[PDB]
């Protein structure tokens, strides 16, 4: 499913992401925009053989099991396919564990390079939340 900007903001807010660990909603929406372009089905393979899955591009080397990443740790205890669902619950639950890992949202390279230090508030502007 390809989410609309405000639709995603609302779903994320409903799932408890607004201000989770100090990161306002705009940060999460901005990250999803640049990580997957709001597409729940997005996948991208990396040079190390691991693959990124879903709306938040969660990596198979540490967070989910895809059956093809030797040494995967599966810290979120879910098959990576669960992260491609139109229902973002699994992605959100796993993202909460990732952002609590110590490096915060820097875990997401697109957030660090394209959202961090920008007016992220613009990402939820105009939305009925």
Curated annotation (Swiss-Prot):
Disulfide bonds join 6-127, 30-115, 64-80, 76-94. Substrate binds at residue 101. In the egg white and polymorphonuclear leukocytes. SUPFAM superfamilies: Lysozyme-like (SSF53955). It catalyses: Hydrolysis of (1->4)-beta-linkages between N-acetylmuramic acid and N-acetyl-D-glucosamine residues in a peptidoglycan and between N-acetyl-D-glucosamine residues in chitodextrins. GO terms for biological process: cell wall macromolecule catabolic process; defense response to bacterium; defense response to Gram-negative bacterium; defense response to Gram-positive bacterium; killing of cells of another organism. It comes from the Eukaryota. InterPro entries: Glyco_hydro_22, Glyco_hydro_22_CS, Glyco_hydro_22_lys, Lysozyme-like_dom_sf. Residues 1-129 form the C-type lysozyme domain. It is found in: Secreted. It is an enzyme of class 3 (hydrolase). Its main location: secreted. The keyword Nucleotide-binding does not apply. One of its GO terms (molecular function) is beta-N-acetylglucosaminidase activity. Pfam families: Lys (PF00062). Its EC number is 3.2.1.17. The active site is at 35, 52. Keywords: Allergen, Antimicrobial, Bacteriolytic enzyme, Disulfide bond, Glycosidase, Hydrolase, Secreted, Signal. One of its GO terms (cellular component) is extracellular space. Lysozymes have primarily a bacteriolytic function; those in tissues and body fluids are associated with the monocyte-macrophage system and enhance the activity of immunoagents. Has bacteriolytic activity against M.luteus. Monomer. Belongs to the glycosyl hydrolase 22 family. PANTHER family: LYSOZYME C. Lysozyme C is capable of both hydrolysis and transglycosylation; it also shows a slight esterase activity. It acts rapidly on both peptide-substituted and unsubstituted peptidoglycan, and slowly on chitin oligosaccharides. This is Lysozyme C.
């Amino acid at each position: 499913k390809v989410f609309g900007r405000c639709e995603l903001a609302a779903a994320m807010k409903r799932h408890g992401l607004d201000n989770y660990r100090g990161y306002s909603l705009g940060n999460w929406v901005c990250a999803a925009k640049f990580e997957s372009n709001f597409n729940t089905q997005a996948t991208n393979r990396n040079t190390d053989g691991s693959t990124d899955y879903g709306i938040l591009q969660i990596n198979s080397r540490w967070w989910c099991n895809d059956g093809r990443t030797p040494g995967s740790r599966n810290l979120c205890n879910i098959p990576c396919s669960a992260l491609l669902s139109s229902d973002i619950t699994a992605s959100v639950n796993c993202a909460k564990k990732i952002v609590s890992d110590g490096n915060g949202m820097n875990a997401w390279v697109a957030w660090r390079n394209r959202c961090k230090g920008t007016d992220v508030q613009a990402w939820i502007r105009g939305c009925r939340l």
